[PDB]
Design an enzyme around this catalytic site. Structure first.
Site, PDB file in Angstrom:
ATOM      1  N   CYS C 201       0.822  -1.201   0.000  1.00 43.53           N
ATOM      2  CA  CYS C 201       0.000   0.000   0.000  1.00 43.53           C
ATOM      3  C   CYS C 201       0.861   1.258   0.000  1.00 43.53           C
ATOM      4  CB  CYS C 201      -0.929   0.002   1.209  1.00 43.53           C
ATOM      5  SG  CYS C 201      -1.940   1.462   1.392  1.00 43.53           S
ATOM      6  N   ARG C 297     -12.371   0.398  -6.388  1.00 38.37           N
ATOM      7  CA  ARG C 297     -11.940   0.290  -4.999  1.00 38.37           C
ATOM      8  C   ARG C 297     -11.746   1.657  -4.356  1.00 38.37           C
ATOM      9  NH1 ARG C 297      -7.953  -0.929  -1.073  1.00 38.37           N
ATOM     10  NH2 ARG C 297      -8.541  -2.811   0.089  1.00 38.37           N
TER      11      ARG C 297
HETATM   12  O1  IMP Z   1      -3.747  -1.772  -3.817  1.00 42.06           O
HETATM   13  C1  IMP Z   1      -3.908  -1.778  -2.600  1.00 42.06           C
HETATM   14  N1  IMP Z   1      -3.751  -0.628  -1.863  1.00 42.06           N
HETATM   15  C2  IMP Z   1      -3.902  -0.551  -0.530  1.00 42.06           C
HETATM   16  N2  IMP Z   1      -4.213  -1.546   0.252  1.00 42.06           N
HETATM   17  C3  IMP Z   1      -4.378  -2.701  -0.428  1.00 42.06           C
HETATM   18  C4  IMP Z   1      -4.251  -2.894  -1.774  1.00 42.06           C
HETATM   19  N3  IMP Z   1      -4.501  -4.214  -2.099  1.00 42.06           N
HETATM   20  C5  IMP Z   1      -4.769  -4.786  -0.954  1.00 42.06           C
HETATM   21  N4  IMP Z   1      -4.713  -3.923   0.101  1.00 42.06           N
HETATM   22  C6  IMP Z   1      -4.966  -4.200   1.530  1.00 42.06           C
HETATM   23  O2  IMP Z   1      -3.829  -4.765   2.139  1.00 42.06           O
HETATM   24  C7  IMP Z   1      -4.175  -6.029   2.745  1.00 42.06           C
HETATM   25  C8  IMP Z   1      -3.003  -6.969   2.678  1.00 42.06           C
HETATM   26  O3  IMP Z   1      -1.869  -6.417   3.324  1.00 42.06           O
HETATM   27  P1  IMP Z   1      -0.618  -7.314   3.698  1.00 42.06           P
HETATM   28  O4  IMP Z   1      -1.132  -8.381   4.632  1.00 42.06           O
HETATM   29  O5  IMP Z   1       0.421  -6.388   4.282  1.00 42.06           O
HETATM   30  O6  IMP Z   1      -0.197  -7.866   2.358  1.00 42.06           O
HETATM   31  C9  IMP Z   1      -5.436  -6.453   2.019  1.00 42.06           C
HETATM   32  O7  IMP Z   1      -6.212  -7.359   2.775  1.00 42.06           O
HETATM   33  C10 IMP Z   1      -6.144  -5.132   1.776  1.00 42.06           C
HETATM   34  O8  IMP Z   1      -6.816  -4.705   2.946  1.00 42.06           O
END
Ligand code: IMP
Ligand code: IMP
Ligand code: IMP
Ligand code: IMP
Ligand code: IMP
Lengths: 356, 356, 356, 356, 59
Positions: C201, C297
């Site tokens: 993100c 989104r």
């Molecule tokens: O393009 C994006 N931008 C921002 N947040 C995202 C995006 N795609 C997924 N996410 C969020 O980030 C989570 C995953 O974060 P991670 O566990 O750090 O990989 C997902 O469940 C979403 O809530």
């Protein structure tokens, strides 16, 4: 009920210590041109320097050549004591024996350049101090790593009793208000401040003892100012901004180490590495330096310093001019016509994000 | 009304924890020469060491050789339990059976070197403890990762009831005031403190559980000192300054791990990499070590330690002398004639800029 | 009189945000063996998982295979909505249609695996939601980046009125107490928490908007707990220690992203780089993915995600077992028999020194 | 009894300063689509822009080409003053003399593009200002590094008395509330804020003077908002998130430096290094830059800037659209229909762990 | 000059003319420097097909 950092004693952790990197000088109403700011400040109660800088009493920084250059530049030099007494007396005589090139030169009432010498604590140090006074030294620095010892205070009192009217006495390094008050009570003409923040110092690692420099300066000034005793911030300075910060916290003079080690007027042979120039720099507590006369600096082996090398910087006058220009810029920003007005400036505390 | 960090419960974030790098020792009025400082301290309520250092009960640190060397150097050694009961009893006997050059050697009433042995929780641990007591051990360390468990307290009480009048019983790792109070109530002669700060420990990454060492020592001391129960700071010590800080926070003894792993007396073969000498150092909860006699430390795979190599350091005596010299320098700076006075020194908290 | 950080409004800087690296779990009185700890937790008000883990609704993480594997492992998977409606219904039916290898598997009254699906906001999203309900999905996640919008709340209310008795509706991402309260009043059965902390993100860099995850979880739980609405921590989790920290802050379930993208069951080809096996991982708001059914989104190209590669990890069961072992170790240290007991543990806040 | 940071004066450390990395924008209730948010904001009390961005008055950023491009993009450009008066007047005339491609172009009552010009202090600066006014300039920036000087305030009063009804007068850089109040009393139509935070600036290292940008904006806004005087945040912006944060702290416009140096319209020849495109970027007080019209920025050698190269970024329109898209995303997250609503958004302060 | 002095009346040129602007092919930019493709008729990129009879042909 308990302290948020643990335990039940609220004074177990005395305070939060700020260093040079934690603060910045806030601009204020300024009617001061940087070229006309008066940078003169008191070194002791009877000596006023045109440039508030003093060279460290280290074997790789201050000898006769560096002392003469510093005295001509507007400051003063303090000769080290890692050598036989006769040699130090000879250095003092060389400085005293040595016209329009240097309008800012610091001289006594006889027109001869000022010089300072460092002595320890003991009977041998007493003989050294008497020899230096006879040679014509102007100020004696009772150089100890921890000046809150009973012996250091007794030595300062004895020196002031004996040769207190001919020369000045400067106390060793302190880092607390109580130690500064004790030095003032003993009779020191100035108080030197700093325990731990040396660049070549390993006291914080080996002994786990230290104190951040800004807070230490503030506490020492809080004890020295009501009696008119100047403060010399010693150690931790890396840029001209640090000098301005140290003087704004209440210190009247700043003592410089590695900033002056790489100059051409410092002792040691120039070293060439891969087309670049460097010069040696070691602390008085390093293994090489104590393998002697100055080994008694820490009441002695467990070295409390390190050896290294710093890049060659050229003539001393150029470095002094750069530092004085930075200080003048700070004075212009804060609207300080004199150093006594810079000593009343305010700080802004910055977080870790402002340093990364 | 709401808490600034979130939520409505002010006790959700219990406290702010300080580690060794967050504090420095403030200099005080000193009348102490480092060469004359007395570094003797209590290990348990009945055992006093000339040097307040104990070797860790790890398979890569302490065995018969290291125990003998530590007992000769002025401290003590604790034999690990990653081996059958008979072999550990053999190690104890070898240490007890074993030189005017060691004036500081720690000895029992009969002139034999002191040694300690680590036992776990369980019926097998009870048999091991009985065998070690019969073999002539001096102190039994009930070694568990979490000593606030009911079974650990029960084992400590049983050992005190059975062989309490012969040997001393030290309780395993705690990190809060309540756990230290519980161990004191159970009858432990000394409390070992630290959950998380090990150098090879991954409890903070795998389980998210830990406690900064300075705050944990302060809390445990607040629980134990009103009863005269000594505190042993275990883990996280990297320099002699850390030992000084741990002793100043209130701990009476410090247990050493990676600082002692690269010495000659430590078990293990010498590793040659690019002409440099290293030795193995691994946690007792790592995959390579738990694969068993120490596998039951956290009632076990989920590794909670790491393996690695530490540079070769040489003889144990040199390392102990360097650490004791650093401690003596700290005692001289803080003006503490004895360790009991060092336990009353003050700290100054530093920010992130002080670590740059 | 003015605020120390600037200005005159004391609410301009609302609070201080704590992330996963700012806190550690404090050990407590324990009688819990890590092997016998119960990790069952509520996903919604009517669905209880044997393992409190959920797969992210991302096109590089969850499809039919990952949902099947997650449901067998004791958790649940959520299918991404970056594809036509018929394809998503086909994925749902593939999971639903699909012996003793998996005792922890999550199932409905008919003995078929539970599965969830993500829907957007709009009219096409409404058709998608109705088709998914017909296909037999068990929980619908209204996946939006900012669920405090009026449209998202109205969509949640419409879904609860229409298919409320058949499936559960989970609200989109929130980061404050007010947004959590707004979602709770709209009839959401679970509140998903996190705006900013995703690894892929870039919301904090591009928009300057974010909220640290520990503080956000605390604030959202303070509004969801009185009504019995579970909280799902989404994003920023890198280790099993973070899962334990999120659950101790009040969350009843954690949604995993990059910890599961590198496994075999995740969609995507196995990339080979210099003899090492990686897999692609990108955010749903990345330029690659929003070029499409996930473009809604952010009410949108101003990419708000990034592309990258994560190392291959192997079968999903192994990763889930490692994470569950870390969580069980945390439960043993904190003395928590159930997740509801873990949700009442205490934190100790650590300084920057504890992270170096 | 003493201040926890040292001394007895509570006002020696005035405040704790926050920078852009220390805060994040908190999400709020939103009914705003990013594509429909109004980004128009005041520049002076009479000039309103469509995109609240202004190009810096630097010799490597803004000339006639960049001024025209910025005016066509919806912002404005301020012409530097490191060239003779006739040359600057020629640049102003070129802008004023230079169809539906640019619906956001900023123009005056006569349909010609708006432009701003930077002037110094003194009689030569007065002649320059009068010549620029005779050339049809729209706004004059009285540009100094420290605007709390008496001369700067007097110059602002003189310009407003002379040509106040034709052009607007913007006061130079300030960092405190008192300085902003002085500029407002002097008659400034807008106040520019920032002393220290420039990326190519070395004021904090050379002089030790500075002020964190978020706190400075908050203080200056508290000084200026009751009188309706706009605040222009100048320096320290590296992303679109920084622009959103600067506007939420109370600023009405952000002045851009290095973000516009790598664009095609920036003055300077394109530079190739290893097949990669870079362009030169230097401060107006750097050694190379002042080697004589801009030499008077700090009353000047002691350089207070540095030189370097930045990657080529392409057309200016692309950069402006990307920054505006980031700002629009922030507006959608915070629920701000207009900039006047974005100025009331709240911040969350993050710790150092959130920056690692 | 050497070829003509040895006895030849004309020299037929290959790579000396491959990089000229009049030669067929697309300009290639590598690290800011301009190149052009040049391949042998028997190369795998060229013989993979017309003109496979150059040496009665895949080696
Ligand atoms: O393009 C994006 N931008 C921002 N947040 C995202 C995006 N795609 C997924 N996410 C969020 O980030 C989570 C995953 O974060 P991670 O566990 O750090 O990989 C997902 O469940 C979403 O809530
Ligand atoms: O070996 C040493 N250890 C610690 N401090 C030292 C040593 N030698 C000199 N000092 C002091 O530390 C200061 C360091 O100056 P700096 O290198 O400019 O920070 C010197 O000016 C002395 O006051
Ligand atoms: O596998 C392990 N995990 C966690 N802590 C351990 C492990 N093995 C030993 N310890 C403890 O961590 C300490 C580490 O000492 P250090 O290496 O000096 O920090 C040891 O003395 C033990 O108390
Ligand atoms: O020589 C210089 N030294 C310090 N600041 C400067 C100098 N020239 C311009 N500035 C200011 O610093 C800002 C730097 O913009 P930035 O690179 O976006 O942070 C400029 O917009 C000016 O306000
Ligand atoms: O694939 C090939 N193999 C061998 N000779 C070739 C091939 N393609 C062309 N030639 C001949 O080799 C010559 C090379 O000339 P050059 O490029 O000046 O070295 C050409 O002019 C052709 O006569």
């Amino acid at each position: 009920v308990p302290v948020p950092t643990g335990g039940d004693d609220p004074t177990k952790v005395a305070m939060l210590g700020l260093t040079f990197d934690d603060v910045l000088l806030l601009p204020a109403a300024s009617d001061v041109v940087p070229a006309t700011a008066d940078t003169s400040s008191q070194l002791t109660k009877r000596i006023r320097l045109r440039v508030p800088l003093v060279s460290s009493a280290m074997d790789t920084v201050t000898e006769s050549r560096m002392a003469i250059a510093m005295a001509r530049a507007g400051g003063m030099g303090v000769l080290h004591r890692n050598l036989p007494v006769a040699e130090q007396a000879g250095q003092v005589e060389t400085v005293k024996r040595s016209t329009e090139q240097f309008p800012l030169s610091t001289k006594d009432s006889d027109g001869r350049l000022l010089v300072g010498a460092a002595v320890g604590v003991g009977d041998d140090a007493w003989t050294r101090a008497m020899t230096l006074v006879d040679a014509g030294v102007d100020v004696l620095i009772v150089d100890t790593a921890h000046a809150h010892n009973r012996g250091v205070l007794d030595m300062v009192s004895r020196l002031k009793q004996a040769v207190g009217e001919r020369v000045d006495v400067v106390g060793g390094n302190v880092a607390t208000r109580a130690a500064a008050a004790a030095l003032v009570e003993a009779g020191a003409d100035a108080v030197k401040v700093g325990v731990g923040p040396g660049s070549i110092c390993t006291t914080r690692v080996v002994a786990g003892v230290g104190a951040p420099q800004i807070t230490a300066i503030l506490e020492a000034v809080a004890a020295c100012k009501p009696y008119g005793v100047p403060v010399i911030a010693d150690g931790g300075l890396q840029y001209s901004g640090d000098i301005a910060k140290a003087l704004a916290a209440g210190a009247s003079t700043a003592m410089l180490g590695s900033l002056l080690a790489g100059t051409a007027e410092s002792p040691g042979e120039l070293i060439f590495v891969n087309g670049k120039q460097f010069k040696s720099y070691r602390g008085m507590g390093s293994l090489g330096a104590m393998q002697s006369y100055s080994k008694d600096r820490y009441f002695q082996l467990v070295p409390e310093g390190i050896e290294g090398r710093v890049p060659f910087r050229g003539p001393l006058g150029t470095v002094i001019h750069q530092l004085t220009g930075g200080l003048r810029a700070a004075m212009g920003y804060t609207g300080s016509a004199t150093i006594e007005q810079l000593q009343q400036a305010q700080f802004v505390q910055i977080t870790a994000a402002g340093l990364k």
